[PDB]
Design a protein around this nucleic acid. Sequence first.
RNA 1: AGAAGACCCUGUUGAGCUUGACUCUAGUUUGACAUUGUGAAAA
RNA 2: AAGCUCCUUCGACGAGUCGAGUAGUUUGGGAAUGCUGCUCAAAAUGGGAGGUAAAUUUCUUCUAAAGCUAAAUACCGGCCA
RNA 3: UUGACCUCGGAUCAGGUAGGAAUACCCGCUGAACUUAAGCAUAUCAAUAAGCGGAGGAAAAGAAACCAACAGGGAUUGCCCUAGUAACGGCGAGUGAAGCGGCAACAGCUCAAAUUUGAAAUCUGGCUUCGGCCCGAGUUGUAAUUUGUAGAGGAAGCUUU
Lengths: 96, 51, 213, 148, 202
Amino acid sequence: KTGLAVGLKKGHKTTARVSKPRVSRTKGHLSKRTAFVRSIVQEVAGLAPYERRVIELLRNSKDKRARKLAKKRLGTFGRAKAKVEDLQRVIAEARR
Amino acid sequence: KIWRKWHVKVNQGQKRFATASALAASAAAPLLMARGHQVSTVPEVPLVVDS
Amino acid sequence: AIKHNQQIPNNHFRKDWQRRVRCHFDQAGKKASRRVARQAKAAALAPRPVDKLRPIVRCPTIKYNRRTRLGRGFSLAELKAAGIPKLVAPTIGISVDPRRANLSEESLAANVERLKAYQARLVVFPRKSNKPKKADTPKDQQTGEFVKSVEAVFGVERPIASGFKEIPKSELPSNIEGGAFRALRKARSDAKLIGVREKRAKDKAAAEAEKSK
Amino acid sequence: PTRFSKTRKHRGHVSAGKGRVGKHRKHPGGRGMAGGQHHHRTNLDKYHPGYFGKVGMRHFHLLRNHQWAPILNIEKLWTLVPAEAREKYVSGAATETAPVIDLLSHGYAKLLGKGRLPQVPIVVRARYVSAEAERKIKEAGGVIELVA
Amino acid sequence: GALKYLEELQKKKQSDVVRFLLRVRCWELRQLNVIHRASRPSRPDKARRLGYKAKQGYVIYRARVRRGGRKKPVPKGATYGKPTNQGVNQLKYQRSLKSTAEERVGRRCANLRVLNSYWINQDSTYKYFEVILVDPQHKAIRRDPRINWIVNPVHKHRESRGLTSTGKRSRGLNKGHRYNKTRAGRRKTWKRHNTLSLWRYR
RNA sequence: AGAAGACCCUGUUGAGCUUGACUCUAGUUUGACAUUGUGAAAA
RNA sequence: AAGCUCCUUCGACGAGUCGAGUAGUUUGGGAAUGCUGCUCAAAAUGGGAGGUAAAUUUCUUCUAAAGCUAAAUACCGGCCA
RNA sequence: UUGACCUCGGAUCAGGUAGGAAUACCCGCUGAACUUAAGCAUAUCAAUAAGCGGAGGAAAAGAAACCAACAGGGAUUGCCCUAGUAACGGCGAGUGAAGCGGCAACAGCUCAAAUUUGAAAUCUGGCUUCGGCCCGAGUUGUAAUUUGUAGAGGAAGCUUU
Ligand SMILES: [Mg+2]
Ligand SMILES: [Mg+2]
Ligand SMILES: [Mg+2]
Ligand SMILES: [Mg+2]
Ligand SMILES: [Mg+2]
Ligand SMILES: [Mg+2]
Ligand SMILES: [Mg+2]
Ligand SMILES: [Mg+2]
Ligand SMILES: [Mg+2]
Ligand SMILES: [Mg+2]
Ligand SMILES: [Mg+2]
Ligand SMILES: [Mg+2]
Ligand SMILES: [Mg+2]
Ligand SMILES: [Mg+2]
Ligand SMILES: [Mg+2]
Ligand SMILES: [Mg+2]
Ligand SMILES: [Mg+2]
Ligand SMILES: [Mg+2]
Ligand SMILES: [Mg+2]
Ligand SMILES: [Mg+2]
């Protein structure tokens, strides 16, 4: 903090205290058991119909069309982008 | 209605100004008689009795 | 129906307000009953203080951060430093707030010494007077001259730092080089143009300069 | 008090002060700000210019604590010094001391240079300061401390 | 634990395995009845995480409600008001179909207390829900401190007053700035904002 | 005498009825998605 | 059987839900504040929020979709003053 | 042929429970028009009256997927202020909150998600009541530990009932 009322790092100067975050902030961390269970279920369950349509588009190297279709089905650009990368990984695993 | 202004807000400072005036007026023989008190045999108006 | 040089009215009285008029004729009656409740609570809580110890916190906005007040409870960082277990403090009149976090050492240190000050003056009677334990106050230390309310003695002492300091002329602080007004104007311009300068650093010409060796 | 009223004065006179012609009806003209553009236009155009229309941009979640910056004109700088201390500086008792005010303790943020200052040097800790406030402080021999 | 596996499986509602089971069970529930007792939960994990235990006093019912919005039950399209209220068709009910199924089960079994409920299936014209109920008169329920709070009289017909999970959603009982009008109760908040409070000294 | 003219006019007062008045609406018709699954044949 | 200090190792955390579109209603909430119907329909340092829609990159704060809990508060309908 | 299990039934079987009243205050659903706009259709009246369902001495809410942007506050509720303000509105008539701050009161907790697995350690009912016994529930999970403030496994020390 620069000790001024305006600027980039404005604010009263104080001694910062470093501590490990709250345990509640550790949410979203993939445990080893959770990843193990989800792999077992993934083999049993399979793929949703819209996922299979995207993988066909990805195999034909229509990446823009695959993202557009993934966006319309999922709803948001961020979730579609994350899903397409996830689908691009499962394609790679299937073909060694 | 019961919404009528029953209570009156008097400034603290006019209450104290009047209370001091009432105490001062209690120290005048003419104002005791003009009120209607029987103070004909009182030696001095600020009648102070030993505690 | 405006008729003269009036101020345009703003009386929100078009919604059958007369059904929801709340008159506080029981202001005096409620006050007397609150005091009766307070007296009963104090009698049942004796000899313990009627309230609980609370920390000092800084008010959370730029308008009020100049002043400190009483918080909800002591953070776990403050309690651990003071040497009090988290689930023992509530049993001895200390307010605990697991949600609060300490981002500065100064505020943490101020609340810890307050916890140690209260612990020094605290007397804990044994769970059974026949056999006192290690953490129970000895019979001799108990005196009987106790305190009624903690917040009266452990309130805020200087909520706002004083502004009546006087210094020798030798210790006169120096001036800002370019002028204090220019220091504020320069600080504002840097924050306003932080993105423009970073965009051109990093310029397309600078990238072209990077591209063209 | 009801005994001080025209109502007690109109007892006996028919119209009660409202006229025989053009009597006191319910709402002759509208209810509220009715007809502000049609038949109450001569009142609004005369006494309330700027009533109708829209000016400026919006501010959806305006918090007024952001805009908090009480001002203090330098003609009242020395009123923040206590009475006993302010005497020796103003009277002319030149010495080795200089007061430090720290405006924020008194509830002020910006300092503006309206009045005048005695030539006694003085140190002020302020969040904001104006061009003339700084200039008049420097001439008196003072120092500006910018704080947050 | 096997309950973690099935929870992960139940998220794959578009998979071949889950879609087949949903289709077959949807046919079975159409034939049976609108409200009928269920011997055991069809989704043991979802029942368990909502408070269901395998002992006497906990009862599962399956309920069925008709999908779609709400049609105004006026005479033959005639609304005798202003044009802004001439709407019959596209209106919607302020509560959820899950609460409607929850409430109808409570009326039939008006000696148990509704704990919670969950979606189990759906088709074109129906949505199927399972309702967990607690018998407050059973000795196994009155003796468990984790559940004997429901014996208290303030908990009668909590599904009618909106005190279940689906009802709290409909009321808008959340802490944020987006729930300003409904944090403490919509009608309670309105009455407070519209009360004109006059004190003794004004 | 019976009745705050029932004719006429005014009111920024109504109501009954009509229609290619203004704004809508029940119903109905058409399209899309869901309910909705399993094969074959060509293009 | 309970705590306290210690660091290595881990650290399960709620799905037709979140979210998106659309329709209706509601709100001070304005490219949509809440609720509901229908269609689509998630993820694990993920998700939500950060009051202007969107793409890119950071930051802050919490941990939804299970539940209980007294006081300050309302009320003269019932009973008694 | 017999014995299980699953699902669905009968019984004036043993033991229980619900309805109705009341509804001033409380929790929901549903839901107007008169009226204002000097007409009127959005608006307003009003998220009100009427109607329907459900409790208590209070009810509801309630221990952050909060507020903030600060040197950060820290469950809920209520009062004063914020504030007739930001904002909404044939941007007309009109409507209209919230953060912060002072105060009244103050209180925190329970589950799902882990194998007791060297021992279902759990519970209703009947008999006996004299310790217990016998059916049944339950392994498609009842006891004990854990709830994110953490926790679990460590090995030293102190300490608690
Ligand atoms: Mg005359
Ligand atoms: Mg007359
Ligand atoms: Mg006149
Ligand atoms: Mg005339
Ligand atoms: Mg005649
Ligand atoms: Mg006539
Ligand atoms: Mg006219
Ligand atoms: Mg008409
Ligand atoms: Mg036409
Ligand atoms: Mg819409
Ligand atoms: Mg409605
Ligand atoms: Mg909306
Ligand atoms: Mg509750
Ligand atoms: Mg009108
Ligand atoms: Mg009129
Ligand atoms: Mg009219
Ligand atoms: Mg009513
Ligand atoms: Mg309650
Ligand atoms: Mg003002
Ligand atoms: Mg309104």
